[PDB]
């Protein structure tokens, strides 16, 4: 997160850290807990490290420097990448992760609600992106979970800033005209959430974008409302 501040306990209790353990253990991506056994993330997180054995999922966590061998983590039982997602590309950038064991909810660890059937055409006005990603371009993984408020833009607007790629109806974009606040590397896979009728909803998954926090250069997110039939089929 660029231009953000620190989060608190219970503030974003769906936020997870997807980490790889090879010779070293590192945070690679965010994700969102959407049920006892289910995390929603970005398909691209597995583009370089497709093997589910090597991943560790941390939930109910604010600080990455808290992690030790005894910090409990979830493991992956199944990865479900969208059938039409293409390695290295922007479309259908979404993946379900079934955990090996169901997690119980606590005040620090609970699910985000998915967009409801009635809100297909809702114009969300109070949106937030969270994660442990760089605080600038070519920067560094941050320790304490960062948050930032970012307005959505139209797809026509988003498209004017990405001349060499197609922004589809299955994407949504967010940013400020003069930049300054944005996700960045290491945030990808995590939530974009908006509060609507007093209830938080997962509107986006952090997907792709050009640099971080640049003026006239909004980040791109997988638009979750358009994958709801796919999510319900795959999880039911």
């Amino acid at each position, epitope marked *: 997160i660029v231009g953000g501040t620190e989060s608190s306990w219970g503030e974003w209790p769906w936020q997870v850290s997807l980490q790889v353990k090879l010779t070293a253990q590192r945070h690679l991506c965010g994700g969102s807990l959407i049920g006892h056994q289910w995390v929603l993330t970005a398909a691209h997180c597995f*583009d*370089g490290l497709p093997l589910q054995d090597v991943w560790r999922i941390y939930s109910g966590i604010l600080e990455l420097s808290d992690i030790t061998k005894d910090t409990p983590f979830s493991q992956i039982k199944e990865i479900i990448i969208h059938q039409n997602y293409k390695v*290295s590309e922007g479309n259908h950038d979404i993946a379900l992760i079934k955990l090996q064991a169901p997690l119980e909810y606590t005040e620090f660890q609970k699910p985000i609600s998915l967009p409801s059937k009635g809100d297909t055409s809702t114009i969300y006005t109070n949106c937030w992106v969270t994660g442990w990603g760089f605080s600038k*371009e*070519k920067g560094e993984i941050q320790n304490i979970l960062q948050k930032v408020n970012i307005p959505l833009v139209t797809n026509e607007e988003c498209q004017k800033r990405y001349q060499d790629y197609k922004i589809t109806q299955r994407m949504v974009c967010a940013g400020y005209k003069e930049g300054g606040k944005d996700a960045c*590397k290491g945030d990808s896979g995590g939530p974009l959430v908006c509060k609507h009728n007093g209830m938080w909803r997962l509107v986006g998954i952090t997907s*792709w*974008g*050009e*640099g971080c926090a640049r003026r006239e250069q909004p980040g791109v997110y997988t638009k979750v409302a358009e994958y709801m039939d796919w999510i319900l089929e795959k999880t039911q």
Partner: antibody
Amino acid sequence: EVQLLESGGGLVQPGGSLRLSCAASGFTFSHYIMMWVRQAPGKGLEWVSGIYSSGGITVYADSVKGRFTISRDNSKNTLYLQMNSLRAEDTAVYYCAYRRIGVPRRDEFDIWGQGTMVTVSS
Amino acid sequence: DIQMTQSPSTLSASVGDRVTITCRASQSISSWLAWYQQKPGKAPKLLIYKASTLESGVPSRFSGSGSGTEFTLTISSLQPDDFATYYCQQYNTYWTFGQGTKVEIKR
């Protein structure tokens, strides 16, 4: 970030052979086209050879077609340039470079090595 | 084949000046043009790609424009770190570099 480290350059007789290696380290979400570019003393950058995927298209500048062979060994996270039938004018610093395939994911388009020196002389 | 021609070969400027370098392709390459900075004995660093897009972590004083056969790299306010040789590169088909432009300190 991903870092590239070249090795294997050195002194060789004309008509001799040399294998350059380029070793990549780090975590990435990207896949890469992989290139060799060289720079002769006091001269401009010259593109030499490329490989678009693990077992994909390999291509060569005309100035080296038939003599050089580019390859990868993913188990070693390494890119190779097998140089045969070397000539005095192949004397240069040889750089490896990675180029990001697909959409920008808050990350880098190019990654370059440090370069390794190749001297062809009788 | 595709020939790239940069100009000028060398140029002299001061900290704070606006600098402009041009690159011409012998045939259209659409927007597949990248610009690079190189210091003596060091690897080149990418500044700009797809003719006008800044690469990750490159300061916004670097900008690029053009399409087809004619491209310019602009440095809005030259800094000390900016004295170096600059290369263009078409990547329409393989890679081809221009012969380079040296940006030297004026006095």
